[PDB]
Amino acid sequence: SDPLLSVLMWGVNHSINELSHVQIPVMLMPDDFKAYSKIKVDNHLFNKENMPSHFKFKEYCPMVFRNLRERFGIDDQDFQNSLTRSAPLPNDARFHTSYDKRYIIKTITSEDVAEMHNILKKYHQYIVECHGITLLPQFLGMYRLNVDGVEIYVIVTRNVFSHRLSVYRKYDLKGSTVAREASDKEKAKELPTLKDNDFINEGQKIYIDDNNKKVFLEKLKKDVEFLAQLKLMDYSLLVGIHDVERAGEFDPNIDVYGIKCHENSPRKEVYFMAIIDILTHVNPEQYSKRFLDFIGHIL
Amino acid sequence: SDPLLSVLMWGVNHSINELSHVQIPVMLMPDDFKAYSKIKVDNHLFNKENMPSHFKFKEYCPMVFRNLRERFGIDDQDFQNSLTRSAPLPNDARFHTSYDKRYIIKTITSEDVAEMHNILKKYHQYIVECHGITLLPQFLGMYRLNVDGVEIYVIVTRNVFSHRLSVYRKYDLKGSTVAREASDKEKAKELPTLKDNDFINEGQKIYIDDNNKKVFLEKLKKDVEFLAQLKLMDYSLLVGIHDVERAGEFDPNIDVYGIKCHENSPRKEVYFMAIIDILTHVNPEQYSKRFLDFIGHIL
Numbered sequence: 001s002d003p004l005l006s007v008l009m010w011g012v013n014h015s016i017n018e019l020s021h022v023q024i025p026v027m028l029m030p031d032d033f034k035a036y037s038k039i040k041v042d043n044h045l046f047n048k049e050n051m052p053s054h055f056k057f058k059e060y061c062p063m064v065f066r067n068l069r070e071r072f073g074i075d076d077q078d079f080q081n082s083l084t085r086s087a088p089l090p091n092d093a094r095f096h097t098s099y100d101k102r103y104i105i106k107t108i109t110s111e112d113v114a115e116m117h118n119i120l121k122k123y124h125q126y127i128v129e130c131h132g133i134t135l136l137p138q139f140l141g142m143y144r145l146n147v148d149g150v151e152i153y154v155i156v157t158r159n160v161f162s163h164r165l166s167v168y169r170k171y172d173l174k175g176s177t178v179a180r181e182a183s184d185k186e187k188a189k190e191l192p193t194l195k196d197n198d199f200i201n202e203g204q205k206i207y208i209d210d211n212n213k214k215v216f217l218e219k220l221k222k223d224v225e226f227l228a229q230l231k232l233m234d235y236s237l238l239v240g241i242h243d244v245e246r247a248g249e250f251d252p253n254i255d256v257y258g259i260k261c262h263e264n265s266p267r268k269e270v271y272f273m274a275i276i277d278i279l280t281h282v283n284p285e286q287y288s289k290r291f292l293d294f295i296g297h298i299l
Numbered sequence: 300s301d302p303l304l305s306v307l308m309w310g311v312n313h314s315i316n317e318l319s320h321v322q323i324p325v326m327l328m329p330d331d332f333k334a335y336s337k338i339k340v341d342n343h344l345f346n347k348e349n350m351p352s353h354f355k356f357k358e359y360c361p362m363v364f365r366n367l368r369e370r371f372g373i374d375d376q377d378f379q380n381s382l383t384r385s386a387p388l389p390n391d392a393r394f395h396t397s398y399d400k401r402y403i404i405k406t407i408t409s410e411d412v413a414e415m416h417n418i419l420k421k422y423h424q425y426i427v428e429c430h431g432i433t434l435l436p437q438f439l440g441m442y443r444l445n446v447d448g449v450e451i452y453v454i455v456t457r458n459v460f461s462h463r464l465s466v467y468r469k470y471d472l473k474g475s476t477v478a479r480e481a482s483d484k485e486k487a488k489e490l491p492t493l494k495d496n497d498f499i500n501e502g503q504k505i506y507i508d509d510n511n512k513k514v515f516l517e518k519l520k521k522d523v524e525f526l527a528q529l530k531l532m533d534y535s536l537l538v539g540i541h542d543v544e545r546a547g548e549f550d551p552n553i554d555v556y557g558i559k560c561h562e563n564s565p566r567k568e569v570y571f572m573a574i575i576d577i578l579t580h581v582n583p584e585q586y587s588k589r590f591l592d593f594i595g596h597i598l
């Protein structure tokens with residue numbers, strides 16, 4: 001056990017238990033976007049084996065994230081279990097993934113937390129309008145952890161990749177002018193992280209039918225315009241391919257970002273694509289177009 | 300809902316959930332008697348309907364009371380349910396009783412808390428030696444509650460009376476020289492609180508067989524010597540009678556203080572007797588003898 005993780009599991013557990021008692025209305029009030037719950041814990045000569053002795057836990061806008069979870073088809077108990085039944089696994093910007101591979105837990109700066117607060121209402125409204133059908137990150141919770149001296153902020157999102165089906169290739173696409181190539185140290189890992197020019201060079205094709213491709217690009221258009229209108233940029237399209245003839249039917253209700261290949265595909269492939277890395281604030285305007293140009297071409 | 304109660308239920312719930320994860324050894328260490336766990340909670344614009352916005356909860360020596368509960372045959376989950384499933388009921392020195400009538404919850408002074416800390420180790424050792432078979436109060440938990448401005452201390456004990464069988468008469472016996480009579484305002488309540496001279500005047504007899512009477516007085520002797528040796532005094536014998544031919548078999552494993560009447564008793568009676576009010580610190584020495592003289596006579 002690493003203390004900051006134990007506090008997170010402890011905290012998510014506590015937070016979801018509290019909410020289970022709250023009466024949940026259909027609507028959020030404007031105050032729900034300014035809300036939080038803090039808990040400070042001090043154990044003197046008690047419970048040394050599991051928890052640290054002195055820790056704080058803060059949940060931002062618990063009602064908003066409760067409402068978002070349900071809008072994204074996530075039940076609070078399942079969300080609880082996925083984060084609590086067993087520890088989240090590391091990858092060390094480092095991230096953790098829930099033991100069941102459903103959720104990602106990433107450390108963010110206080111600046112990112114400030115930007116999240118800044119866009120949360122508009123983000124929530126967007127999710128309402130598109131009925132939760134989007135390629136944007138699905139934000140599920142946001143927390144502050146303190147363990148004697150160290151303060152960190154985390155956000156929780158839905159995993160873009162599958163919780164069963166492995167992924168043998170991964171891309172990260174921005175469609176920028178500034179030459180985007182991968183480095184060689186990455187290449188030597190179980191799954192590297194290829195970039196723009198690796199794609200427009202290793203002759204990578206995505207075999208999805210002309211309907212699936214139409215829906216996707218329509219979504220992508222709306223999402224990216226929303227991102228641009230908030231003056232956000234430097235986001236990527238995360239692309240991940242699962243070869244069936246290596247490890248292939250999936251659950252579209254769990255692996256919500258999956259798209260099957262069309263019938264004429266050279267190999268049985270499942271694609272996982274969504275937008276990631278949205279919280280940084282040449283400009284945002286053309287970045288969106290430049291992003292849309294690129295993806296329209298490569299797909 | 301009265302806020303201080305909600306905090307207590309909340310707090311007992313939280314505390315028992317924490318312990319459920321702790322590995323419980325057979326032995327307590329000396330540090331366990333100096334231990335505690337504090338939790339401070341701040342909700343900003345959140346959860347107004349159930350909890351107060353700002354409260355603190357402190358549990359003293361959680362390991363000791365965990366150990367005592369089990370020694371008194373109380374399971375932590377049942378204890379939890381009894382205090383949490385529905386609110387405790389008032390009687391307003393005021394007290395509350397769990398909704399299932401199993402437990403008493405009384406407010407105490409910081410001075411009482413200090414005295415409890417002072418005697419807890421010796422008290423625990425006494426419970427070990429008598430294998431939990433005693434007429435002393437069964438202390439099950441001790442807490443501090445804060446709700447914005449107001450700080451209170453509570454202790455939890457097992458109810459001397461039954462959780463089913465009603466009680467139509469109640470005495471409170473010290474066996475003092477100083478004339479002990481009841482007042483008339485008490486008499487007009489559903490169950491008054493009669494005192495020494497009400498007993499040695501209304502010709503009250505306790506019809507228990509000569510064996511039951513032998514065991515009881517032996518216990519009483521040991522208990523009271525223990526109390527005296529801690530320089531404690533001003534405790535009473537709480538006596539409560541249940542007439543079967545008004546409202547009578549009981550569970551000796553729940554109503555642990557009950558004694559059936561012998562076969563020749565004029566009416567079918569069940570007696571509930573135990574020591575109460577021990578935490579005040581002419582002297583303690585003879586008070587014990589004086590107490591023992593009286594009870595030997597009246598029983």
Ligand SMILES: CC[C@@H]1C(=O)N(C)c2cnc(Nc3ccc(C(=O)NC4CCN(C)CC4)cc3OC)nc2N1C1CCCC1
Pocket residue numbers: 091095097104106136137138157158159160161170189190191193275276277278
């Ligand atoms: C909130 C961060 C952001 C985001 O916005 N969302 C929505 C997101 C959703 N899902 C994922 N999923 C994964 C993305 C990359 C990897 C990956 O690179 N895995 C390798 C596997 C082999 N080896 C152990 C080394 C690492 C694994 C993922 O989950 C299995 N990542 C997301 N990211 C990324 C993660 C942190 C920065 C970008």
Ligand SMILES: CC[C@@H]1C(=O)N(C)c2cnc(Nc3ccc(C(=O)NC4CCN(C)CC4)cc3OC)nc2N1C1CCCC1
Pocket residue numbers: 390394396403405435436437456457458459460469488489490492574575576577
């Ligand atoms: C920790 C306080 C102390 C103690 O040490 N123990 C062990 C204790 C264990 N059990 C009890 N039980 C009851 C004792 C008295 C009464 C009683 O007087 N009830 C009336 C009933 C009708 N009406 C609503 C008005 C009040 C009810 C009890 O439980 C049903 N009391 C105890 N007391 C006493 C309680 C506070 C001071 C003395």
